[PDB]
Design an enzyme around this catalytic site. Structure first.
Site, PDB file in Angstrom:
ATOM      1  N   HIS A 175       6.228   1.516   9.485  1.00  0.00           N
ATOM      2  CA  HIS A 175       5.204   2.399  10.048  1.00  0.00           C
ATOM      3  C   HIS A 175       3.835   2.115   9.412  1.00  0.00           C
ATOM      4  O   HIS A 175       2.787   2.303  10.038  1.00  0.00           O
ATOM      5  CB  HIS A 175       5.591   3.869   9.827  1.00  0.00           C
ATOM      6  CG  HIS A 175       6.960   4.215  10.326  1.00  0.00           C
ATOM      7  ND1 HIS A 175       7.283   4.245  11.668  1.00  0.00           N
ATOM      8  CD2 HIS A 175       8.104   4.509   9.660  1.00  0.00           C
ATOM      9  CE1 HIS A 175       8.564   4.535  11.809  1.00  0.00           C
ATOM     10  NE2 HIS A 175       9.086   4.700  10.606  1.00  0.00           N
TER      11      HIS A 175
ATOM     12  N   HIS B 271      -1.077   5.188   1.397  1.00  0.00           N
ATOM     13  CA  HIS B 271      -0.876   4.290   2.523  1.00  0.00           C
ATOM     14  C   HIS B 271      -2.139   4.339   3.348  1.00  0.00           C
ATOM     15  O   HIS B 271      -3.071   5.101   3.053  1.00  0.00           O
ATOM     16  CB  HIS B 271       0.315   4.737   3.382  1.00  0.00           C
ATOM     17  CG  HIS B 271       0.185   6.178   3.861  1.00  0.00           C
ATOM     18  ND1 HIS B 271       0.650   7.146   3.075  1.00  0.00           N
ATOM     19  CD2 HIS B 271      -0.331   6.827   5.013  1.00  0.00           C
ATOM     20  CE1 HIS B 271       0.470   8.370   3.644  1.00  0.00           C
ATOM     21  NE2 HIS B 271      -0.137   8.176   4.841  1.00  0.00           N
TER      22      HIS B 271
ATOM     23  N   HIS C  79      -3.819   3.905   7.548  1.00  0.00           N
ATOM     24  CA  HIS C  79      -3.638   3.989   8.984  1.00  0.00           C
ATOM     25  C   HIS C  79      -4.824   3.142   9.440  1.00  0.00           C
ATOM     26  O   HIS C  79      -5.924   3.259   8.881  1.00  0.00           O
ATOM     27  CB  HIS C  79      -3.782   5.423   9.479  1.00  0.00           C
ATOM     28  CG  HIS C  79      -2.690   6.325   8.959  1.00  0.00           C
ATOM     29  ND1 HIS C  79      -1.585   6.488   9.688  1.00  0.00           N
ATOM     30  CD2 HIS C  79      -2.519   7.098   7.811  1.00  0.00           C
ATOM     31  CE1 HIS C  79      -0.720   7.326   9.071  1.00  0.00           C
ATOM     32  NE2 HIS C  79      -1.295   7.709   7.909  1.00  0.00           N
TER      33      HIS C  79
ATOM     34  N   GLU D 244      -7.456   8.703  11.358  1.00  0.00           N
ATOM     35  CA  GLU D 244      -6.769   9.765  12.061  1.00  0.00           C
ATOM     36  C   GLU D 244      -7.742  10.925  12.224  1.00  0.00           C
ATOM     37  O   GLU D 244      -7.855  11.510  13.301  1.00  0.00           O
ATOM     38  CB  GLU D 244      -5.528  10.172  11.282  1.00  0.00           C
ATOM     39  CG  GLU D 244      -4.635   8.998  10.938  1.00  0.00           C
ATOM     40  CD  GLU D 244      -3.208   9.416  10.737  1.00  0.00           C
ATOM     41  OE1 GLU D 244      -2.915  10.088   9.724  1.00  0.00           O
ATOM     42  OE2 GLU D 244      -2.379   9.075  11.603  1.00  0.00           O
TER      43      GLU D 244
ATOM     44  N   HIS E 160      -4.719   7.496   2.730  1.00  0.00           N
ATOM     45  CA  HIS E 160      -4.130   8.775   2.377  1.00  0.00           C
ATOM     46  C   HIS E 160      -3.438   8.662   1.029  1.00  0.00           C
ATOM     47  O   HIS E 160      -2.524   7.837   0.858  1.00  0.00           O
ATOM     48  CB  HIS E 160      -3.110   9.205   3.423  1.00  0.00           C
ATOM     49  CG  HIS E 160      -3.744   9.541   4.749  1.00  0.00           C
ATOM     50  ND1 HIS E 160      -2.971   9.540   5.834  1.00  0.00           N
ATOM     51  CD2 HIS E 160      -5.008   9.988   5.167  1.00  0.00           C
ATOM     52  CE1 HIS E 160      -3.672   9.970   6.920  1.00  0.00           C
ATOM     53  NE2 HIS E 160      -4.925  10.246   6.507  1.00  0.00           N
TER      54      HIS E 160
ATOM     55  N   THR F 160       0.862  13.639   9.125  1.00  0.00           N
ATOM     56  CA  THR F 160       0.458  13.118  10.414  1.00  0.00           C
ATOM     57  C   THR F 160       1.530  12.274  11.093  1.00  0.00           C
ATOM     58  O   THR F 160       1.288  11.723  12.167  1.00  0.00           O
ATOM     59  CB  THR F 160      -0.842  12.328  10.312  1.00  0.00           C
ATOM     60  OG1 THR F 160      -0.647  11.219   9.434  1.00  0.00           O
ATOM     61  CG2 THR F 160      -1.967  13.213   9.769  1.00  0.00           C
TER      62      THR F 160
HETATM   63  C1  LIG Z   1      11.962  14.727   3.113  1.00  0.00           C
HETATM   64  C2  LIG Z   1      10.727  13.917   3.565  1.00  0.00           C
HETATM   65  C3  LIG Z   1       9.704  14.575   4.241  1.00  0.00           C
HETATM   66  C4  LIG Z   1       8.587  13.869   4.676  1.00  0.00           C
HETATM   67  C5  LIG Z   1       8.480  12.499   4.444  1.00  0.00           C
HETATM   68  C6  LIG Z   1       7.247  11.773   4.936  1.00  0.00           C
HETATM   69  N1  LIG Z   1       6.780  10.746   4.006  1.00  0.00           N
HETATM   70  S1  LIG Z   1       5.459  11.048   3.391  1.00  0.00           S
HETATM   71  O1  LIG Z   1       5.418  12.343   2.795  1.00  0.00           O
HETATM   72  O2  LIG Z   1       5.107  10.177   2.319  1.00  0.00           O
HETATM   73  C7  LIG Z   1       4.196  11.027   4.577  1.00  0.00           C
HETATM   74  C8  LIG Z   1       4.276  10.902   5.954  1.00  0.00           C
HETATM   75  C9  LIG Z   1       3.036  11.006   6.546  1.00  0.00           C
HETATM   76  C10 LIG Z   1       2.051  11.205   5.599  1.00  0.00           C
HETATM   77  S2  LIG Z   1       0.387  11.454   6.016  1.00  0.00           S
HETATM   78  N2  LIG Z   1       0.074  10.330   7.076  1.00  0.00           N
HETATM   79  O3  LIG Z   1       0.244  12.773   6.519  1.00  0.00           O
HETATM   80  O4  LIG Z   1      -0.305  11.314   4.764  1.00  0.00           O
HETATM   81  S3  LIG Z   1       2.620  11.263   3.963  1.00  0.00           S
HETATM   82  C11 LIG Z   1       9.510  11.827   3.764  1.00  0.00           C
HETATM   83  C12 LIG Z   1      10.629  12.537   3.324  1.00  0.00           C
HETATM   84 ZN   LIG Z   2      -1.108   8.988   6.401  1.00  0.00          ZN
END
Ligand SMILES: Cc1ccc(CNS(=O)(=O)c2ccc(S(N)(=O)=O)s2)cc1
Ligand SMILES: [Zn+2]
Ligand SMILES: [Hg+2]
Length: 257
Positions: free
Chosen positions: A61, A91, A93, A103, A116, A195
């Protein structure tokens, strides 16, 4: 399952993750004229001097740089936060073109990419418990604009070759995340969510006013990553961003006037 393609993209997410239509979904458009300056907002406190990076990996992703979060190594405090938040990973985007990729947008304006830095509230014990709380995460969002090269980003750019496909990882120690911060720490803040699925509404978003610039060739390297695994048909990792969601019953506060 979910992804960014037309068949499994953002517009389909709600079928598996109903919270996609929740009350505090991110990202949002930051309307600078209606954002409210809040004088009770404290300055951010970013302590990344003891940060210990471990690995970089393509998760299909995006690519993420993970940090050792077993102790208060790199933490965020202050601002609209109450408590210490630990850096666990960062990470990006990005888009297929320079005019898209971020985003969050400012007055409908899109940036080439968005960084992020993900933090979790230590009072909750571990990341897994944090994602069950309305104040569990704090993500620092930094916009990237194309311009001059960002020295601190090159180390990341040089390792992308070894993690071209999904599931690939590489050791990435001794990376200093301080080289990714703008000069000013002024920000906008509002309650939101992750997100990407599971789209948990556990995030206090802190979006920096000042973007960092990266060269055309630096962001170009991002676009050569693959969403697919090795041996599978190649799909370039681009446009891994989610469209702005309605603000609803939320107000964006600014730390600056
Ligand atoms: C149990 C569990 C819950 C959620 C995740 C998502 N993984 S995560 O928390 O690192 C993210 C997904 C999207 C991110 S953003 N783009 O908002 O910063 S941060 C993994 C595992
Ligand atoms: Zn992100
Ligand atoms: Hg939550």
């Amino acid at each position: 399952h979910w992804g960014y393609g037309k068949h499994n993209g953002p517009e389909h997410w709600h079928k598996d993750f109903p919270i996609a239509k929740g009350e505090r979904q991110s990202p949002v458009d930051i309307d600078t004229h209606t954002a409210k300056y809040d004088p009770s907002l404290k300055p951010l406190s970013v302590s990344y001097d003891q940060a210990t990076s471990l690995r970089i990996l393509n998760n299909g992703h995006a690519f993420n740089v993970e940090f050792d979060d077993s102790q208060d190594k790199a933490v965020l405090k202050g601002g609209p936060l109450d408590g210490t938040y630990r850096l666990i990973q960062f990470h990006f985007h990005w888009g297929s073109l320079d005019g898209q990729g971020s985003e969050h947008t400012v007055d409908k304006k899109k940036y080439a990419a968005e960084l992020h830095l993900v933090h979790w509230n230590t009072k909750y014990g571990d990341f897994g418990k944090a994602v069950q709380q309305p104040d569990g995460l704090a993500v620092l969002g930094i916009f990237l604009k194309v311009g001059s090269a960002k020295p601190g980003l090159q180390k990341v750019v040089d390792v992308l070759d070894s993690i071209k496909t999904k599931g690939k990882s590489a050791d990435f120690t001794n990376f200093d995340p301080r080289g990714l911060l703008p000069e000013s720490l002024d920000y906008w803040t509002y309650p939101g969510s992750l997100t990407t699925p599971p789209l948990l509404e556990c995030v206090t978003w802190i979006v920096l006013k000042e973007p960092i610039s990266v060269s055309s060739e630096q962001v170009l390297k991002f676009r050569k990553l693959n969403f697919n695994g090795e041996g599978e048909p190649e799909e370039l990792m681009v446009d891994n961003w989610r469209p702005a969601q309605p603000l609803k019953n939320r107000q964006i506060k600014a730390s600056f006037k």
